[PDB]
């Protein structure tokens, strides 16, 4: 590959495809791309004993194995027979928190690739990832890595292996059909959306490349006529000399079984066994003529060499990445329709709808990458429209930016451009559209999200929606320095690391604590390592973890919280009650949004929520930030009369509710499952006394009086631990879960290999080392993984001043709720004597 | 990656023997292809003008 040819192909056409991989716990990714780099960069030779990564440029992934830094790479891959294409592949880690990171980073790719283990098969990360990708409306191209782990490790026959693959594809297609009704992408076992890989042994090909091999050596026309029936349920008929999809003979297997798997196992058994005897007799028939010095290797590298000579240059995956993974000229429409805040009806929408390098520029930086000098970190981003050049200034923008809010803008000169390779970097002077560039000089004004427009002429430009994660981070940790005279360096490192890891979010509570919010234990571990080692060289102290809780109403309020305004001209009354859990999960799952007609919300409430007619028609407002489950309501006999004046002072009431839900009196945390119904609301005709000064805080007082005087109850999170392990480890996992507040959800003998997958919940309070405790007693055979996606109410009722956990015991009583209440109010600095029920009762 | 392996008993069994150890293959019942497939005319027009894969 010549860099000049790369530049020529860059500003050539939309043939350059954009892809982002997807996998879980080493199921096919960095070894596969190491094979790709060896195919493209021949001088970069892989080792003999140890595996070569080519994706963990940093050190933490090398020392742990679990990748953290998504290292995208772009390669000249002449894998299309008689053609060539450009591929922009975004490598991805596999861990759950890092899976949320990838899901945040999957906005860029027009399509998605999956690497599933041939033996382990489906996992939990994929169970979430399929749903996430279908929610983003991106392409899907399944692939299966670690196939040598099936033929060699298990020593299965062909038919059992093919049935295993059938079951894998059936489960994947069922999950996709449950996610949505994408008939175009669904049902893809043989159309080209199935790649094969043995990354450790470079055994990687597809149906098309297989048919191409046979047509090249001694064969017939291409796979358009042959590969259309190599899939099972159709055997070969040497009598008729064709594939008998009708009733076949007895001693016959599927064309996959006898054309592909037969010689596959043949050469595997000839290279592994009989390496001294059956090597040349089997290799001079179809293989290479490697010298005697080449046969003096161990079994693994020799096998990899033979697999590489067989699949000569891996001309199989470009044949599918161009097939179904669309070009950027095609994917610009839906990607922008889903990402851009406005619709396609905007001038900028139809402008950037095509990948015009000469037009309104709309860049978007997602992942921030550091350099050898920690004081300056670059930024990677997808150029959807326009053409960036060296030294061109751009209007960097923020997530809070808006057409009216011109505060989140800051100009900056693009210093030096690079190309993402993760081992080297190619400097660039001009960048066309559909491009990934390593931006320099823009490191300062960047936030977790980033959007770019032209510094002049790009006016009337909206921004891209803030990305989701599909995994709400619940962990809360404090990080205070060793010596207190090191605050600014620690905070600078904290900000740099925040810009590095988008999943987290800095915070400083009223108690003056330096707080961090992580998704998992290993997430916070890698974060603090990169902090103390890279972004801040100061010795820092660390506390223990704690889960960020929320409040909930156990039942209806007893009395009407009458929070009257201080002007003696506003008497608000809000009675709060809970709602169905599934409806709140759907409101959080973006099922029933707020921007709908009155009839639309009415039908949604009468069908989904099963609410009353006037009840649903009287919808007041939504929850905090229009994303959380906080239902506002306003219905009454005088409410139907004087709703106009109150409607004038309803915006301030909704704002006060949204700001009060952000921090409640229970534990200074969020609130959920609250249906605040406003019954009595005196509204004065004079807006001077009835202004905002007696709108926001009176409403906040009423809301807190209803939430505190209506049988409160906390809500602690529950993870979902899927531990693939044998039966003895199953009993051990039962013991540990019983000893740590567990709840056995599902446990079954997952086929394909002996790994009984134990699916069960763990609370975050008792999740401090679930993986460590499971791997300690199970003798290293129960590598489970957790994901926080289920919040449940603790059984305590922390209102009675009778239970007190004085000593350092772990609150075995059902006063554990009050224990966590006292602990949280002591950690937050607020008044630990939470007795505002009589103070906030507001008697009248 | 829990290293899976099938530790056989003695070297009298075949090489690739399904050890009754793991589970049923799929226990599938939704597949319904008792009747012949539609790719018949082009199938007859789709010969196999090449020697087999590894018959020898």
């Amino acid at each position: 590959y010549e860099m000049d040819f790369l530049a020529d192909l860059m500003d050539n056409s939309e043939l350059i495809r954009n892809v982002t991989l997807c996998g879980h716990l080493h199921h096919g990714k960095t070894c596969f791309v190491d094979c790709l780099i060896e195919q493209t960069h021949p001088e970069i030779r892989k080792r003999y004993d140890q595996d070569l990564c080519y994706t963990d440029i940093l050190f933490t992934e090398q020392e742990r194995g679990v990748g953290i830094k998504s290292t995208p790479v772009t390669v000249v891959l002449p894998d299309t027979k008689g053609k060539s294409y450009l591929f922009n592949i975004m490598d991805t880690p596999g861990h759950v928190n890092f899976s949320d990171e990838v899901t945040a980073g999957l906005r860029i790719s027009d399509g998605v690739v999956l690497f599933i283990d041939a033996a382990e098969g489906v996992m939990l990360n994929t169970e979430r990832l399929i749903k996430h990708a279908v929610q983003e409306r991106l392409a899907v191209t399944v692939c299966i890595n670690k196939i040598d782990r099936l033929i060699l490790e298990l020593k299965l026959p062909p038919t059992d292996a093919y049935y295993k693959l059938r079951h894998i594809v059936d489960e994947v297609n069922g999950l996709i059909s449950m996610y949505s009704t994408d008939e175009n992408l669904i049902l893809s076992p043989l159309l080209g959306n199935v790649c094969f890989s043995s990354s450790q042994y470079s055994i990687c090909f597809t149906l098309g490349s297989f048919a191409k091999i046979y047509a090249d050596t001694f064969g017939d026309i291409n796979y358009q006529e042959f590969a259309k029936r190599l899939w099972g349920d159709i055997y070969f008929n040497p009598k008729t000399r064709k594939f008998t999809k009708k009733a076949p003979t007895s001693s016959s297997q599927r064309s996959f079984v006898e054309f592909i798997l037969e010689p596959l196992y043949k050469i595997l058994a000839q290279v592994v066994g009989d390496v001294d005897t059956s090597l040349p007799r089997t290799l001079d028939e179809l293989g290479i003529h490697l010298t005697k010095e080449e046969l003096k290797l161990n079994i693994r590298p020799l096998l990899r060499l033979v697999c590489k000579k067989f699949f000569g240059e891996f001309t199989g995956f470009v044949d599918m990445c161009v097939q179904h993974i669309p070009s950027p000229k095609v994917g610009a429409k839906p990607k922008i329709e889903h990402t851009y805040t406005g619709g396609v009806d905007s001038d900028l929408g139809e402008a950037m709808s095509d990948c015009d390098p000469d037009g309104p520029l709309m860049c978007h930086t997602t992942k921030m990458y550091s350099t050898d000098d920690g004081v300056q970190f670059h930024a990677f981003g997808r150029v959807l429209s326009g053409t960036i050049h060296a030294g061109q200034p751009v209007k960097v923008l923020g997530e809070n930016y808006t057409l009216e809010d011109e505060e989140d803008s800051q100009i900056c000169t693009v210093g030096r451009l690079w190309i993402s390779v993760a081992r080297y970097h190619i400097e660039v002077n001009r960048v066309p559209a559909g491009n990934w560039v390593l931006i320099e000089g823009v490191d300062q004004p960047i936030v977790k999200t980033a959007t770019i427009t032209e510094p002049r002429g790009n006016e009337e430009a909206q921004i891209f929606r803030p990305l989701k994660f599909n995994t709400t981070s619940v962990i809360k940790i404090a990080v205070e320095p060793v010596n207190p005279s090191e605050l600014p360096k620690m905070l600078d490192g904290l900000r740099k690391v925040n810009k590095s890891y988008p999943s987290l979010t800095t915070k400083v509570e009223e108690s003056g604590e330096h707080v961090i919010l992580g998704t998992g234990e290993l997430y916070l571990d890698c974060v603090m390592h990169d902090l103390r080692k890279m972004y801040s060289e100061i010795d820092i102290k660390v506390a223990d973890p704690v889960v960020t809780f929320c409040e909930t109403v156990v039942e209806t309020s007893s009395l009407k919280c009458f929070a009257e305004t201080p002007n003696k001209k506003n008497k608000i009354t809000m009675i709060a009650e809970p709602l169905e859990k599934g409806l709140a999960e759907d409101i959080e799952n973006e099922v029933v949004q707020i921007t709908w007609n009155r009839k639309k919300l009415g039908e949604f409430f009468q069908t989904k929520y099963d609410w009353d007619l006037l009840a649903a028609r009287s919808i007041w407002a939504f929850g905090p930030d229009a994303t959380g489950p906080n239902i506002l309501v306003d219905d009454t006999l005088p409410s139907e009369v004087d709703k106009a004046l109150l409607g004038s002072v309803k915006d301030s009431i909704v704002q006060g509710f949204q700001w009060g839900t952000r921090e409640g009196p229970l534990c200074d945390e969020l609130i959920r499952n609250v249906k605040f119904k406003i019954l009595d609301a005196v509204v004065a005709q004079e807006p001077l006394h009835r202004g905002g000064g007696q709108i926001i805080p009176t409403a906040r007082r009423v809301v807190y009086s209803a939430f505190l005087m209506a049988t409160p109850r906390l809500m602690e999170p529950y993870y979902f631990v899927e531990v693939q392990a044998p039966a003895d480890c199953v009993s051990a996992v039962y013991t540990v879960l019983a000893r740590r507040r567990g709840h056995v959800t599902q446990d079954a003998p997952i086929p394909g290999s002996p790994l009984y997958t134990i699916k069960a919940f763990i609370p975050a309070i008792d999740s401090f080392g679930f993986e460590t405790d499971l791997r300690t007693h199970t003798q290293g055979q129960a590598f489970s993984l957790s994901v926080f996606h289920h919040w449940q109410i603790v059984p305590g009722d922390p209102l009675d001043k009778s239970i007190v956990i004085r000593p350092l015991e772990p609150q075995p009583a059902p006063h554990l709720a009050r224990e966590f209440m006292i602990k949280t109010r002591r950690r937050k600095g607020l008044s630990e004597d939470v007795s505002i029920s009589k103070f906030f009762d507001d008697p009248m | 990656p829990n290293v899976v392996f099938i530790k056989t008993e003695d070297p009298d069994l075949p090489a690739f023997y399904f050890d009754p150890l793991i589970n049923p293959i799929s226990h599938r019942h939704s597949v319904k292809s008792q009747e012949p497939l539609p790719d018949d005319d082009e199938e007859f027009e789709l010969p196999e003008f090449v020697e087999p894969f590894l018959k020898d």
């Binding site: 039966a727 009993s731 | 056989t8 009298d12 069994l13 075949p14 023997y17 050890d19 009754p20 150890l21």
Partner: peptide, 28 residues
């Protein structure tokens, strides 16, 4: 040799079935 292989397969299948029955009884 073929009959020996079939008998060995039957014996290993019986042994694995007994072991799996014991393991499943313990797990239940």
């Amino acid at each position: 040799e073929k009959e020996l292989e079939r008998q060995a397969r039957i014996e290993a299948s019986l042994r694995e079935r007994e072991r799996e029955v014991q393991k499943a009884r313990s797990e239940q």
